[PDB]
Each structure stands twice: as structure tokens, then as C-alpha cells.
Amino acid sequence: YRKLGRTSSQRKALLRDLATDLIVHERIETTEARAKEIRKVVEKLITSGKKGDLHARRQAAAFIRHEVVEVVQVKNRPVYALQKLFDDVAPRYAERQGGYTRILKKGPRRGDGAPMVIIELV
Amino acid sequence: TKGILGRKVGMTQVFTENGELIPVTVIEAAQNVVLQKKTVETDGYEAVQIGFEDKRAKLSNKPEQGHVAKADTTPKRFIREFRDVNLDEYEIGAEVKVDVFAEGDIIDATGVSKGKGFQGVIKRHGQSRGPMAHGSRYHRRPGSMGPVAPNRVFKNKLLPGRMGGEQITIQNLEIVKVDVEKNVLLVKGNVPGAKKALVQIKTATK
């Protein structure tokens, strides 16, 4: 696996943040190496969401971030990213075995020349 | 004097008849074919050329197809030459099987060793390192480059550089088992290379 310029705990935090971002926004822009790691991370999360039971949910809750996706008027109650993963994203790919993300190359960044890429869950 | 080509599969152990326990290397040697015979009146020396592994037509070119079309076979991934053989055997287009060897034979194993990258003197050359305490600032360094008089440094002053990936021969290895149906040869000991590496198995020269 890739060390991404940072220690173990910093790398874990970066991976958790990026995976939650891709779940919430469904399309993000980043560098190529980060995309090639969150590929694995996010697809394992989606598989856990497809499995569906309480053990899988508690395992996904140890990695996903506690963030609010939206507030829904149902008494207005917020929706969290774990709820979106288990209730919305996972049923979308109930008939697809693998490969829930794709990577699309964009080009270099002005400030440092880094190769920037788009990753989306489709 | 016999020869064959194979791939290194792995490394394991077997129990002998006495109850001993010995380590073995597994060589898989399917699809060997005789491709060409070199004679003194045409080449200057005598040898037999053997091709080892079948490969897809997409991965070959016209010269390869032309060369193997004389032996009525598909293009081969590896091709090598064996000298000090008897050319009265080895018909063109014939098959070579692990039957040429029997349990108890003594062989020579040729391969290319595992690759290490850029390496320093004490790993590459087994040098001795300096003191680690007592005020020293000299730990993993090459040593003195030489005396003062020549105004230069001599050849074979050993320095860092690329380490592995060299041709190695190991002599006097014993064959423990031959399995014709699986095309498998069991050799006592170990051979150079990593897994899936090409190995030449030949009769020992001494």
C-alpha cells in the first residue's frame, strides 16, 4: 500500500475524510494517488453497506465520519452519512458485483504541478 | 548428458523411505520442444536448441513464427541452447520430458538471482562496519580508497551499486522425484531466482 507522505494516524484520518466526502458528494476532485487508495476504501464500505445487518453497520460506523448530509422534513430531522450509505447508495448497486467507482484524469495543478483527477461513484 | 527447461514453482519438503526429512524445490517443465540442431560444418560447434513455453499468437511476430514453423510447433516464450549433448538423439520437432532424468541423478541448476536494488558495501560485499559509539562518526562506509603514492585508486575497489540479478549456477544437486503426469521435477536444495523464474536443469559436468 501507499504511504501518502504522512504517518499512520494522519494517513488513516485522510482516508476516512476522503471516503466520507465521496459518499456524501458522490463526485470529488483530488490527486491521483489519493484516488487510487480511496478506490479500495470506498468499495469495501459499499460492500459492507450491501451486506446490510447490524454487525456490518457497526463495522462501517467505526470508519465513516459523523457528518450531516441533509435535513429532511418528516419535526425536521437530519440525515447522516452512515444512513445515506446504508439506505441510498447500497441499494443502488444491488445487482452489480464489483467496481462501484471510476477515475477520470483531468490534468496538472497550477500551484505545484500535481496531476488532478476526478473520482465518482458510478 | 541431458537437459531441460522449467519454471520454479516453490519450495517444500518430503519424507524419505528411512523417515528422513529433506527440503525440495519444485520445477515444472511442460512443453519442451527441439527447435534446431547446430553442427560443426554449419555453425562451428555442436548444440541443440530447445523452446520451453507456449505463448499467444498476439505476443509473437513474423520472425518467430517462421523460426518455429520448421519444427511444426507454436511460438515459445523461452529458447536456450545445450552443448555437450549427443545430437544423434533429438529429432527436430520432438518432445522433451522429465523422463530423461531418474531419481538419484546429479544435476546443475542455472538461473538468474533475485534482484536487490542499489546497495551499500557491507551488504553487497560483506564488509565490516565501524564502531557505533565511543565518539565514532564512521558506521557503514567503504573504507580507505588506497595509498597516496599512485595518485589514483586501483580497480576492484569495492563500492556501492546494484546488487542482484546475476546468472548463478549451483552444482551437484540431487533429483528426489520425477512425476511424468504432472511434468514435475523435485530437486533437493534450492535454486537461484524468484517464483516463476526460468531454470535450466542439466547433467552435472563433474
Binding site: - | 514453482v9 516453490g10 517444500t12 519438503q13 518430503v14 519424507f15 523417515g19 526429512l21 519444485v26 515444472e28 512425476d179 504432472k182 514435475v184 523435485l186
Partner: protein, 103 residues
């Protein structure tokens, strides 16, 4: 792991070994084979660890003899073990029982 290695080494795989775990007491009947005469010697003790896979799996047995601790390591499928008995089954929480050395 390799499938060819598994198929080649399958015939030499002993089927008479019983089930045991690290932690329980066993008795080993080992063939002591001198030059011309072979006898049977008994080693009884606690299984301290089990390690490996397939034909290259080994296990270690610990005993106290005459005030000195002795450890003995065998291949599981060796033909020099005439037979293996499980005397009693223990209750441990570990796979490797190295803390008994210091105890």
C-alpha cells in the same frame, strides 16, 4: 499457498493424527532408530504451540524432567511418531503458550 505443491505432497499426509490444540496434554510414541535396532520412547507434556500449514506443520511439547524444562518439536506428519494420544484437554486463552517458560 500453491495448488501444485498441495497435490504433490498430499500422499505423504498422515491421516491418523487426532485433534489437539495448544494447551492440552499429549503423549508421543517416538521411534528411536539406532543404527540397526529401533525402540519406542515416550514423551508426555503440554502442547505449547502449533505452527505452519500442510506437510510443513510442526508442534512443540514441553515437560519438566529432573528439575529442568525440556521442549521437543516435531513435524505433525512425520513417520517417526508411532502414535499420538491426547490425555486431557485444557482451557487456555492463547495460541502460543510462551508464558509457561518463565513460570
Amino acid at each position: 499457498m500453491n495448488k501444485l505443491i498441495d497435490e504433490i505432497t498430499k500422499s505423504q499426509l498422515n491421516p491418523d493424527v487426532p485433534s489437539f490444540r495448544p494447551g492440552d496434554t499429549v503423549r508421543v510414541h517416538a521411534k528411536v532408530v539406532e543404527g540397526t535396532r529401533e525402540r519406542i520412547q515416550l514423551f508426555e507434556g503440554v502442547v505449547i504451540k502449533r505452527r505452519g500449514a500442510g506437510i510443513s506443520e510442526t508442534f512443540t511439547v514441553r515437560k519438566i524432567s529432573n528439575g529442568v524444562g525440556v521442549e521437543r518439536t516435531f513435524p505433525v506428519h512425520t513417520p517417526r511418531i508411532a502414535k499420538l494420544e491426547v490425555i486431557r484437554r485444557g482451557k487456555v486463552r492463547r495460541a502460543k503458550l510462551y508464558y509457561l517458560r518463565n513460570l
